[PDB]
Amino acid sequence: FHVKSGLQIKKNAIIDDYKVTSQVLGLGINGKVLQIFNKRTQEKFALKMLQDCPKARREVELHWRASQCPHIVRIVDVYENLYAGRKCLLIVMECLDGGELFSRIQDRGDQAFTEREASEIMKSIGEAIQYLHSINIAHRDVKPENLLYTSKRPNAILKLTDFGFAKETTSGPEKYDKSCDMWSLGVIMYILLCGYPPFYSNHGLAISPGMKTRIRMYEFPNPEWSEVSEEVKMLIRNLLKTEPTQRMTITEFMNHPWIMQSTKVPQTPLHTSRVLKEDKERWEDVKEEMTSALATMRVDYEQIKIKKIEDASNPLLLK
Ligand SMILES: [Hg+2]
Ligand SMILES: [Hg+2]
Ligand SMILES: [Hg+2]
Ligand SMILES: [Hg+2]
Ligand SMILES: [Hg+2]
Ligand SMILES: [Hg+2]
């Protein structure tokens, strides 16, 4: 391929390069993307603040090395500065003002979301994951808050952000990690096709979706209503959720007719806009629930650290 420059965390102050309002800087302590403007170009730009440290710097290394895909937001500058008393890892990103994916769909006069758009979109998102996954990165937080449009007007591009759980799928960790992305793709494509999450149960114990991956007990909408969703559209959204060992591969997904020969799939108008519009709250409810589902599925590692203190050989000494 093409050797590209390594990441170099600029150490100088950030405010002599971008107009961090040093006011506005304040709302960014919990990690909410704020806005800055480059000084000698006065350009756009986003800023996400993180507590500097290995585990914040690992993910920023990760996202940095995946700026490449046109389907991944672009990080333009990384700064390691001293803000207040702490040590801040300030990451400047290309700004995406086009919208949050479902926040676009949700609001349509009546344009109506059509299955082929549902497919075009799934190739987009599947593009990103197919990128990330070939360079051994597992994103593991692919959810609606993280899929944003670039511009606003037409021709807009869809890219994923927030790599704060992104991990290196390389050493069961190949499969398991990777599969939190496949599951998310099964969960997004179902809400995209129905307007509802695959979080309904009629059978037994209404085990939650997160826990459902550690097993126990997914059902689809009334065959007639909006379940107009092809039985080929049903198998793929089902293969993408089974978590066991017979889990799908992003190549498998991308090697799918519906995916690959997309923009040829029928333009079956769908109920997605209506549902998300009709209860803006149960949509917020759905969102929390996928966040949660994700947090309960992710498995992470950690080193063992034992405390040490000196052995008291003679409690009567000068010590
Ligand atoms: Hg940290
Ligand atoms: Hg790419
Ligand atoms: Hg910070
Ligand atoms: Hg922005
Ligand atoms: Hg994307
Ligand atoms: Hg998983």
Side-chain angles (χ1 to χ4, degrees), residues 116 120 142 186 200 248 262 290:
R116 192 168 86 186
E120 306 190 299
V142 174
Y200 291 98
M248 210 174 198
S262 80
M290 173 187 188

Side-chain angles (χ1 to χ4, degrees), residues 30 56 66 72 83 112 119 128 130 135 146 161 185 190 198 208 239 272-273 292 299 303:
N30 298 195
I72 291 301
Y83 179 66
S119 291
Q130 183 189 45
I135 61 156
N146 297 156
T161 194
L185 281 189
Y190 183 116
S208 27
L239 300 159
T272 326
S273 257
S292 273
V299 336
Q303 65 217 36

Side-chain angles (χ1 to χ4, degrees), residues 86-96 98-103:
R86 329 311 169 55
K87 31 190 345 213
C88 280
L89 187 46
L90 289 147
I91 319 81
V92 190
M93 296 151 87
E94 137 200 42
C95 184
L96 303 141
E100 190 202 299
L101 161 66
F102 293 92
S103 297

